Each structure stands twice: as structure tokens, then as C-alpha cells.
Amino acid sequence: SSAYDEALATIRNDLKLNFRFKADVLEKNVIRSILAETKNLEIDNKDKDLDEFKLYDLLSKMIKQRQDSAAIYLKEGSPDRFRQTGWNELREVDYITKYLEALPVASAEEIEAKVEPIVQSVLEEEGELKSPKEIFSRIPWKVVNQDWQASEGAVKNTVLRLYNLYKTD
């Protein structure tokens, strides 16, 4: 939990700087929102230790939630008078992605550099690709934390993205 505690210190520090120098208001909402979900996260994972990978999936959910909300607003309109709700969702995604990319985990290219040899090797041994479930099997979902340095979910996204590229049906 050394990396998790160090990571949550920078988020707290950016909160102290934001109040000190009156930085962007929306950033204050992002950090305050992250800390509350961290507060919920600590309660439900006590004594289990907190690796940064479990923090990675927390920020991943926040990024995915606001992207879904942004998609609806950027198609049917924001409800506020100034029509800024849809763009506010995406602005927060950038703030959350800034901390997500600072965690000591693999980037999108490193995880793809390990799953792509597996997706291709599945298709050549079998001919046609129907579902990602045949690619999840050849993934060691027990030791991808120090050989790959990735969470449980970031590998899921990489496979699903690669599957949609390689699928033959």
C-alpha cells in the first residue's frame, strides 16, 4: 500500500494548492469527489491492503461514468442554461486521467504489447474469433500485477478493445 498512500498524498496536496492559489473550481470538485469515493473504498476493503491497482479501478469507474454521462448530454443537450454540463463531464475526465497516468502501472501500449500476441495466437490456432471469452482463458488472471503491472480491469479493457479489432464475425 506504499504506492496507494503516496498517490493519495498528491491528490490531497493538489487540494491544498487549489485552495491556496484559487485554481480552477471544477478541479476542486474533482478532487473532492475522488476523496469521497476513496472514503467509500477504504470501508469496503479493510485489512485487505490497498494496492494502486484497486485504486486504478476506482478512477477507471469515475472516468467511465462521466464519459457515459457526457455522451448523452453531447447528443441531447445539457440541462443547464449555459449548456456546459456535457463539457464539464469531459473536463473532469482529464483531471482524473492525470492522476490515473501517474500511478506506477502499465500504459495502454504495454498491456496491448502482451495481449496482442495472445489474440493473434488464438485466431491462428482456431481460425475464427467469436467472443472474447476464448481470450480470457489464455490470460493468467493470478499473476498480472508484477510481471505485467496492471489491474484486473485494465487487462479486461485491453482484450475487449483488441477483440473488437480482430473479430471475424
Partner: peptide, 28 residues
């Protein structure tokens, strides 16, 4: 037995363009 011609990449990345194993159609 049957092998691909030279200068055929084993991987590529062109955004969302579908990724497929190169098939030399002359051999069909």
C-alpha cells in the same frame, strides 16, 4: 509449405481499422 511474401508486416496499428492476418489471395 506455403509462406507469405516478403515485406508483409506481422502486426499493424491504423486506428480502428480492422486487424486481420494477411492472406495472400493468390493461394485461394
Amino acid at each position: 509449405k506455403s509462406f507469405l511474401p516478403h515485406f508483409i508486416p506481422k502486426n499493424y496499428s491504423y486506428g480502428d481499422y480492422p486487424r486481420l492476418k494477411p492472406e495472400n489471395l493468390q493461394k485461394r
